[PDB]
UniProtKB/Swiss-Prot annotation:
This is Beta-lactamase TEM. Substrate binds at residues 209-211. Changing residue 212 to T: In TEM-5 and TEM-24. PANTHER family: BETA-LACTAMASE (PTHR35333), BETA-LACTAMASE-TYPE TRANSPEPTIDASE FOLD CONTAINING PROTEIN (PTHR35333:SF3). The active site is at residues 45, 143. Belongs to the class-A beta-lactamase family. InterPro entries: Beta-lactam/transpept-like (IPR012338), Beta-lactam_cat (IPR045155), Beta-lactam_class-A (IPR000871), Beta-lactam_class-A_AS (IPR023650). It comes from Escherichia coli. The keyword Iron does not apply. Changing residue 213 to S: In TEM-3, TEM-4 and TEM-8. GO terms for molecular function: beta-lactamase activity. One of its GO terms (biological process) is beta-lactam antibiotic catabolic process. The beta-lactamase present on pBR322 was cloned from plasmid R1 (R7268).
Length: 266
């Protein structure tokens, strides 16, 4: 059962594309393993977690409310919007939009949330404020998934993203209640089944968010561990492959299997 770094390299061979990987201890933030940690990759829908972090930060500051109801129209609807397309009459609350953006990867939900903060530049500013000067959101859904080769728009580095996620889930950046809501949304993710979740044993905890884009882009961010408690952060991205969705999913799932099989190693 291949060691994780061996598997990551193998995934590059299989996919004909670069793969980035990092694994952090959740408690200490120390890097346990990495591969292309400082290369840039399209975030795709993995940014939706960071967006809801920015929204929760505003909630904590009294600038936003979880229960605030936003009505919107047909014009706002874009592709891959399975929840927002069913609430044209009634609208959705901020809390519901974040649930939709994270757990159902709802694109229109993400756009409505970006409007609440004033656009992608404001998400980038939130990230800068907390110390991540690498992750950048430039565009709205769905254009942010374009993934033109070597275009740095709408990208992160594995090492930047992993630490930003750790800070949102466990740091003082968000209140306890907000930290817990963010992880609860990620735990409830329904749009990542063929990825890390497919390798997880019974009894484990996983809070995650996946992404897919053009040019074969695929990725996932996660906090996971045994015994009902997360203990590591994992970030995986790939871009460039011509392989099918199922083939890309399979490679990520196999990286997960290698991580799980060697987890107990001292």
């Amino acid at each position: 059962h291949p060691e994780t770094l061996v598997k990551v390299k193998d995934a590059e061979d299989q996919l004909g594309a670069r793969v980035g990987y990092i694994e952090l201890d959740l408690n200490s933030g120390k890097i346990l393993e990495s591969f292309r940690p400082e290369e840039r990759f399209p975030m795709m829908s993995t940014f939706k977690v960071l967006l809801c972090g920015a929204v929760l930060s505003r909630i904590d500051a009294g600038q936003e409310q979880l229960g605030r109801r936003i009505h919107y129209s047909q014009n706002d609807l874009v592709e891959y919007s399975p929840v927002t397309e069913k609430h044209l009459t009634d609208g959705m609350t901020v809390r519901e939009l974040c649930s939709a953006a994270i757990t159902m990867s709802d694109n229109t939900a993400a756009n409505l949330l970006l409007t609440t903060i004033g656009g992608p530049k404001e998400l980038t500013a939130f990230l800068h404020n907390m110390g991540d000067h690498v992750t950048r959101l430039d565009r709205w859904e769905p254009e942010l998934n374009e993934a033109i080769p070597n275009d740095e728009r709408d990208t992160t580095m594995p090492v930047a993203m992993a630490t930003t996620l750790r800070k949102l889930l466990t740091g003082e950046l968000l209140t306890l209640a907000s930290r817990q809501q963010l992880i609860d949304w990620m735990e409830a993710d329904k749009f990542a089944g063929p990825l890390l979740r497919s390798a997880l044993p019974a009894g484990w905890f996983i809070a995650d968010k996946s992404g897919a884009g053009e040019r074969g882009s695929r990725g996932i961010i996660a906090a996971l561990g045994p015994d009902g408690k997360p203990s590591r952060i994992v970030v995986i991205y790939t871009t460039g492959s011509q392989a099918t969705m199922d083939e890309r999913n399979r490679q990520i799932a196999e990286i997960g299997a290698s991580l799980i099989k060697h987890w107990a190693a001292a």
